[PDB]
Design a protein around this ligand. Structure first.
Ligand SMILES: CCCCCCCCCCCCCCCCCC(=O)OC[C@H](COP(=O)([O-])OCC(O)COP(=O)([O-])OC[C@@H](COC(=O)CCCCCCCCCCCCCCCCC)OC(=O)CCCCCCCCCCCCCCCCC)OC(=O)CCCCCCCCCCCCCCCCC
Ligand SMILES: CCCCCCCCCCCCCCCCCC(=O)OC[C@H](COP(=O)([O-])OCC[N+](C)(C)C)OC(=O)CCCCCCCCCCCCCCCCC
Ligand SMILES: CCCCCCCCCCCCCCCCCC(=O)OC[C@H](COP(=O)(O)OCCN)OC(=O)CCCCCCCCCCCCCCCCC
Ligand SMILES: CCCCCCCCCCCCCC(=O)SCCNC(=O)CCNC(=O)[C@@H](O)C(C)(C)COP(=O)(O)O
Ligand SMILES: CCCCCCCCCCCCCC
Ligand code: SF4
Ligand code: SF4
Ligand code: SF4
Ligand SMILES: [Zn+2]
Lengths: 156, 91, 115, 44, 186, 117, 89, 205, 182
């Protein structure tokens, strides 16, 4: 949550509110990003890999976390499809389905990333899937900081 | 330059972390300036004053009521089976 | 006039009357367990009188689909009263214990306010 | 001058995303052998 | 290297997909980490390392957190440099106030100018969204930098026109600096 | 030569997928043979399951069958054939080939609905 | 206390017999000392030569929308946005 | 080109047109009208009595494997003879598409529950029971899910007011949270935002 | 309305002191009861224990005073799960019709002394859901409120402003001197 408070500081920098931004609107965005947000977001994305490495060194390898997560809450894939599951609870049960890749929207098809798929369907596979979505979100953040064009911020 | 512990405690922390340590805390040298020069937002594709008319740019009027497909086939008509889309293997 | 619709749990009026009497029997059995558990300031006889008044203000309807919708809603309140699923603030809502009564004569309504 | 908020030319260096492991010092045979040697010295 | 149970496709990553090695070296390694608490000692080592870090705490209220010139706080009514209040009673801000906090009543002033006679903001109905800041054509209503305005009483969180005018008079310098440093973004 | 896992929990691997698929396809033919010939659903299901049965009978390898069908892995093909068998059992009783059970009411599918017209 | 009987710039004051002055025995009444009328008639009118003049609030993009005022009619012409007065001799 | 105007997908239009004609050919009894709206989405307007088999067909056909039922949406149109309409949104992972199945329901007419087909509807129709008040026959558990336990009426029905009929406060002579008639401290100021000039000439026919 | 004094006037004024009841009260018993009240209010404004309640989005901000930028444990403030082991309930979020007896029961089972912080616009006056059917118009009409944190999401700076103003309210709270003058 130290890093999460850094991202709400970034939200306050771009929109003026820490949490409820009112920023993304029909027809683009309301305001252009201020100058110097690139260096701040880049420094945060450089340090966040090491922060996740420390958090995974504490949480992921531990026997108590494994005994509290693994083989617990196992959901089958046909139950996931029949009960209308979506997202990580689909992806943790082995089903290869990510809406950012199959039906792309808002320039997800010009950026490249990986879709994490679980195997067993328990809590541990979904936790590892969430950490892998975190790291692939860092990759997409890297690509979007690498390329952006100069132009308008909203439709005309 | 930056506030930290003495390098003996830094080496102790780097040994106990299992990796080389980069400072999580932000500093004034690593961030951008709070006062920036005043920017100029560039114009988009249709702020040209000569060529554009709204009738060629009106997306709200180019929509239509939904098409009755049986009626459309009846008007326009007077192998593999139809699929809703491309086959994706999620297995 | 005439209309052909799908029924709700009953074909004729006699089955709907039987379902309403089953509601009255089940609510009668559920009232002494409501009184001892919910911590409400209402005697069992006052609860049964309120149940009778709730049925009396719905005696006037004649349509079987309206009657069966009332049966379905009364069964929902019964299921929300068998399991406790509620507090004492919502059980007393039938009695309207906080609303001060308003007069019905035209002189007192003229004196008090335009409503 | 930066008239709009843009990345610098030449691009950025690569943001890390992979998990690097921490430094491991103990092999299991080394751990069992050091435990046996330390226990024998302590019993002496 | 441990083998893979299911061969991964291109562009996908499988977690918990590596088969556990049945050779003697890996079994002895995981056995030593089991009975001698290897990952527990690694987690304790990481935690003891982060004891020696510098705290991220700031000494409130002597030290206050970073902010932005676009920050949304207390509503305020600006005035012109000549001293006349900026608001011209056009009721755009109340028409766009999505929780209907603003209440505007107006009439012709004695000099003929179009002015308000009642500008109320329910601050308990506000969501601090800046739609009145964007809707205002003469830049009268703004979100001031103030957010330390917690009250002991619910009635003090219902701003009158005079309280908003006092907020515009009090917070004039920072609001002027923010609208100097922010107006070409909008 | 057998698949270690499907990469998908809840479905174990199948020992004999070919006989299960052929039995389900024969049961789909037996359920669809009671349908009237004028119904288009019978013709579409017969074309589908005849193409799938020729794909099963032509290919003896499992992954070659999965590539030749192209829908997915063979356990999901068993799941699809079981679902279509349940459908072919149900549509004999649901009777879909007849005319409309209910005609269109006046101003039922008009948008915007508030107009006088 | 004189803030209870003070009159705001909208011509509002509570009467002495009103019950609504009982809310001000524990919290003082807020009356803005800077009335806009006095500070807009303290500004002298601007003498101009042209037949029409433009007003934009004196700040550019931070003022009001730019409007054009005709000065052929004798007298003081008041901008309807900011209240600045123009005159042509 | 036209950068402001949204560019549609022609191949998705052709695939959904062929599949919509396929659905209208497969079920002549229950499917009432197949339409293809702007934005490449297929709407299959059906009879009420075909609420349960058609979705079952869309669960179980080989070219219709709509395994996910993402939500069921109810729209209250009081001007029609059958008032409510019920919209089933289904997602197909095998063919990577979506379909909408729309039916109409009166205030008293049942709907056959889709819980035998899709289990997510096990709560979703419950929401349509609570917000609108349509009875779902053969439901394993039909109760109010989102409103109060002593709540009377159905909220998202358009005959229901926005602020409700009653309010709740705390009362000390009864030591309870009590129910009172609704009085707003400030009323909801209704804004007349109706368009006096028509803008779209293609929707008056 | 008064303003903050000019630095010459501020240099003219003496120091206020910690005690809000003054230095001397011209009686030995009044001075002893005032100092006992000062010690008691120091023990009470130090480490108020808020309640794990968290109705809505404003709660996510509540963890930003848990998060190490702002650190509510520096002030003594520390969360406890049970309402019996809590001084404060931070009503923060939308209070609906189903949560009226829940909030009343959780507030009533909490022991005296009781101070309630109303964080967020929904808890203050309903907010963006004020005109709806299910939302109670603020949490004042069910339970008493001592502190009204006004932001919709408050900044955690603005939430700790409400917490510090509650600590100043407890510092001015007088019971033993009231007992002597009752
Ligand atoms: C694994 C285990 C490893 C153990 C290593 C042990 C040896 C090293 C060691 O002790 O280093 C810590 C410290 C200096 O190393 P450091 O961590 O690099 O310095 C701290 C920062 O770098 C300082 O950075 P800065 O530039 O921000 O400094 C500003 C200032 C910041 O000032 C403050 O924080 C002021 C508030 C705290 C002090 C209040 C007054 C206390 C005295 C009255 O820092 C200090 O005052 C640091 C000195 C603190 C002295 C002790 C404080 C009280 C301890 C009471 C219990 C004993 O040394 C000692 O505390 C003991 C030195 C040897 C003994 C002589 C003094 C007794
Ligand atoms: C300066 C000090 C720094 C360190 C301070 C902290 C010290 C370390 C931590 C202390 C305790 C921490 C809190 C409790 C944690 C409990 C964890 C736990 O037990 O988890 C259960 C887990 C469970 O094991 P698991 O995680 O593998 O689970 C899978 C296996 N099943 C399900 C079958 C159990 O770990 C253990 O039980 C491990 C064994 C613990 C007891 C040690 C047995 C030693 C046996 C003798 C060794 C002989 C070697 C060979 C000799 C040959 C001679 C010829
Ligand atoms: C020596 C150790 C004991 C000292 C006791 C001092 C008591 C009087 C005193 O000065 O109390 C300090 C404070 C109230 O005094 P205050 O006005 O804030 O400051 C004085 C400024 N010259 O009082 C406090 O902050 C708390 C006082 C606690 C008193 C306990 C009961 C005493 C009888
Ligand atoms: C303790 C708390 C008490 C709670 C009381 C509230 C219980 C719920 C009350 C209801 O269910 S109201 C709906 C009841 N249903 C009906 O009245 C259906 C219509 N009623 C009838 O037609 C009646 O004529 C009977 C009930 C058939 C009486 O007719 P008899 O003469 O043949
Ligand atoms: C695992 C340790 C085995 C040996 C333990 C005992 C070692 C010492 C034995 C006694 C030695 C006496 C020397 C005179
Ligand atoms: S910030 Fe938004 S909610 Fe607050 S007064 Fe302005 S328009 Fe209304
Ligand atoms: S939008 Fe601005 S000028 Fe118009 S009524 Fe509101 S505050 Fe006044
Ligand atoms: S006051 Fe604002 S942030 Fe808080 S619960 Fe309500 S909407 Fe969410
Ligand atoms: Zn002007």
């Amino acid at each position: 949550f130290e890093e999460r408070e850094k991202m709400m500081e970034f939200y306050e920098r771009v929109s003026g509110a820490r949490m409820h931004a009112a920023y993304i609107r029909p027809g683009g965005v309301s305001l252009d990003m201020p100058l110097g947000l690139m260096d701040d977001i880049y420094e945060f994305a450089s340090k966040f890999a090491e922060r996740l490495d420390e958090v995974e060194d504490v949480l992921t390898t531990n026997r108590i976390w494994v005994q509290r997560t693994e083989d617990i809450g196992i959901v089958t894939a046909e139950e996931a499809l029949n009960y209308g599951f979506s997202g990580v609870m689909l992806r943790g049960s082995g089903i290869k389905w990510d809406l950012r890749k199959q039906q792309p929207y808002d320039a997800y098809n010009l950026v490249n990333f990986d879709v994490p798929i679980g195997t067993k369907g328990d809590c541990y596979d979904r936790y590892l899937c969430r950490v892998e979505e975190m790291r692939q979100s860092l990759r997409i953040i890297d690509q979007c900081l690498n390329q952006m064009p100069a132009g308008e911020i909203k439709t005309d | 330059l930056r506030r930290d512990v003495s390098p003996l405690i830094q080496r102790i922390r780097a040994f106990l972390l299992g990796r080389e340590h980069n400072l999580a805390l932000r500093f004034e040298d690593g961030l951008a300036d709070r006062t920036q020069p005043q920017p100029e937002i560039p114009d988009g594709p249709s702020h040209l004053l000569s060529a554009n008319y709204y009738c060629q740019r009106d997306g709200r009027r180019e929509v239509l009521p939904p098409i009755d497909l049986v009626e459309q086939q009846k008007q326009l008509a007077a192998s593999k089976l139809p699929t809703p889309g491309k086959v994706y293997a999620w297995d | 006039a005439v209309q052909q619709v799908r029924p709700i749990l009953s074909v004729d009026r006699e089955e709907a009357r039987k379902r309403a009497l089953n509601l009255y029997k089940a609510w009668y059995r559920q009232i002494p367990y409501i009184v001892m558990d919910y911590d409400i300031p209402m005697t069992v006889e006052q609860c049964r009188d309120k149940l009778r008044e709730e049925f009396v203000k719905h005696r006037n309807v004649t349509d079987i689909r309206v009657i069966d919708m009332l049966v379905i809603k009364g069964q929902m309140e019964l299921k929300e009263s068998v399991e406790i699923w509620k507090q004492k603030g919502h059980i007393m809502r039938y009695w309207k214990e906080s609303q001060d009564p308003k007069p019905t004569d035209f002189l007192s309504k003229f004196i008090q306010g335009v409503n | 001058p930066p008239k709009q908020d843009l990345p610098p030319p030449g691009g950025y260096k690569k943001i890390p995303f992979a998990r690097v492991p921490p430094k491991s010092y103990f092999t299991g045979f080394t751990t069992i052998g050091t435990y046996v040697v330390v226990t024998a010295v302590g019993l002496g | 290297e441990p083998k893979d149970i299911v061969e991964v496709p291109k562009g996908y990553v499988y977690v918990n997909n590596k088969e556990l090695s049945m050779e003697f070296a890996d079994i002895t390694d995981r056995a030593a980490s089991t009975m001698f608490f290897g990952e527990l000692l690694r987690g304790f080592a990481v935690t003891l390392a982060h004891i020696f870090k510098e705290p991220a705490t700031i000494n409130y209220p002597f030290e206050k957190g970073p902010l932005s010139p676009r920050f949304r706080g207390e509503h305020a009514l600006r005035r012109y440099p000549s001293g006349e209040e900026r608001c011209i009673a056009c009721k755009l801000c109340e028409a766009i106030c999505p929780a209907q906090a603003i209440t505007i009543e107006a009439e012709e002033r004695a000099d003929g100018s179009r002015r308000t006679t009642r500008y109320d903001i329910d601050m308990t109905k506000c969501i601090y969204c800046g739609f009145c800041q964007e809707a205002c054509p003469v830049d009268a209503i703004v979100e001031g930098p103030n957010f330390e305005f917690s009250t002991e009483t619910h009635e003090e969180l219902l701003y009158n026109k005079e309280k908003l005018l006092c907020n515009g008079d009090k917070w004039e310098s920072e609001i002027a600096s923010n609208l100097q440093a922010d107006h070409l973004y909008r | 030569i057998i698949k270690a896992s499907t990469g998908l929990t809840g479905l174990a691997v199948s020992t004999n997928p070919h006989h299960t698929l052929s039995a389900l396809y024969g049961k789909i033919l037996r359920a669809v043979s009671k349908m009237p010939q004028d119904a288009s659903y019978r013709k579409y299901t017969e074309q589908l399951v005849k193409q799938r049965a020729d794909s099963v009978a032509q290919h003896k390898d499992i992954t070659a069958l999965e590539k030749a069908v192209g829908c997915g892995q063979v356990e999901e093909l068993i799941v699809q054939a079981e679902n279509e068998l349940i459908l072919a059992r149900k549509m004999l009783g649901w009777k879909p080939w007849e005319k409309l059970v209910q005609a269109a009411p006046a101003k039922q599918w008009d948008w915007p609905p508030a107009q006088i017209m | 206390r004189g803030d209870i009987e003070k009159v705001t710039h909208t011509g509002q004051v509570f009467d002495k017999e009103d019950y609504r002055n009982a809310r001000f025995v524990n919290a003082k009444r807020y009356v803005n000392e800077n009335w806009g009328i006095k500070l807009i008639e303290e500004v002298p009118p601007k003498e101009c030569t042209e037949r029409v003049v433009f007003c934009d609030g004196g700040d550019g993009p931070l003022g009001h929308p730019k409007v054009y005022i005709n000065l052929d009619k004798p007298g003081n012409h008041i901008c309807g946005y900011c209240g600045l007065r123009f005159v042509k001799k | 080109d036209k950068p402001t105007v949204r560019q549609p997908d022609a191949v998705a239009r052709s695939h959904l047109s062929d599949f919509g004609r396929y659905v209208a050919e497969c079920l002549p009894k229950y499917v009432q009208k197949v339409q293809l709206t702007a934005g490449d989405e297929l709407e299959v307007l059906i009879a009420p009595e075909g609420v349960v088999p058609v979705l079952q067909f869309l669960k179980d056909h080989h070219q219709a494997q709509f395994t996910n039922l993402v939500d069921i949406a109810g729209v209250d149109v009081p001007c029609r003879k059958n008032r409510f309409e019920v919209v089933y949104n289904l997602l197909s992972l095998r063919y990577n598409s979506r379909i909408r199945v729309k039916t109409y329901t009166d205030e008293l007419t049942p709907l056959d529950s889709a819980c035998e087909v899709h289990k997510a509807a096990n709560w979703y129709e419950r929401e349509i029971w609570d917000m609108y008040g349509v009875f779902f026959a053969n439901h394993p558990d039909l109760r109010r899910i989102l409103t109060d336990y002593g709540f009377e009426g159905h909220p998202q029905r358009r005959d229901f007011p926005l602020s409700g009929y009653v309010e709740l406060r705390y009362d000390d002579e009864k030591k309870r949270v009590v129910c009172e008639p609704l009085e707003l401290a400030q009323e909801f100021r209704k804004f007349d935002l109706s368009a006096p000039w028509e803008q779209f000439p293609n929707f008056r026919n | 309305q008064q303003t903050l004094p000019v630095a010459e006037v501020a240099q003219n004024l003496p120091k206020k002191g910690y005690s809000p009841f003054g230095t001397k009260q011209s009686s030995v018993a009044e001075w002893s009861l005032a100092r006992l009240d000062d010690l008691l209010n120091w023990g009470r404004k130090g480490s108020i224990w808020p309640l794990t309640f968290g109705l809505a989005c404003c709660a996510v901000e509540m963890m930003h005073i848990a998060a190490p930028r702002y650190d509510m444990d520096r002030y003594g403030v520390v969360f406890r799960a049970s309402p019996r082991q809590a001084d404060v309930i931070i009503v923060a979020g939308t209070l609906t019709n189903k949560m009226a007896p829940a909030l009343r029961k959780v507030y009533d089972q909490m022991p005296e002394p009781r101070w309630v912080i109303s964080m967020g616009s929904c808890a203050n006056g309903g907010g963006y859901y004020h005109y709806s059917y299910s939302v109670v118009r603020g949490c004042d009409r069910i339970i008493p409120v001592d502190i009204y944190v006004p932001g919709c999401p408050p900044t955690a700076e603005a939430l700790m402003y409400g917490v510090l103003q509650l600590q100043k309210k407890v510092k001015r709270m007088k019971t033993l001197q009231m007992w002597y003058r009752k």
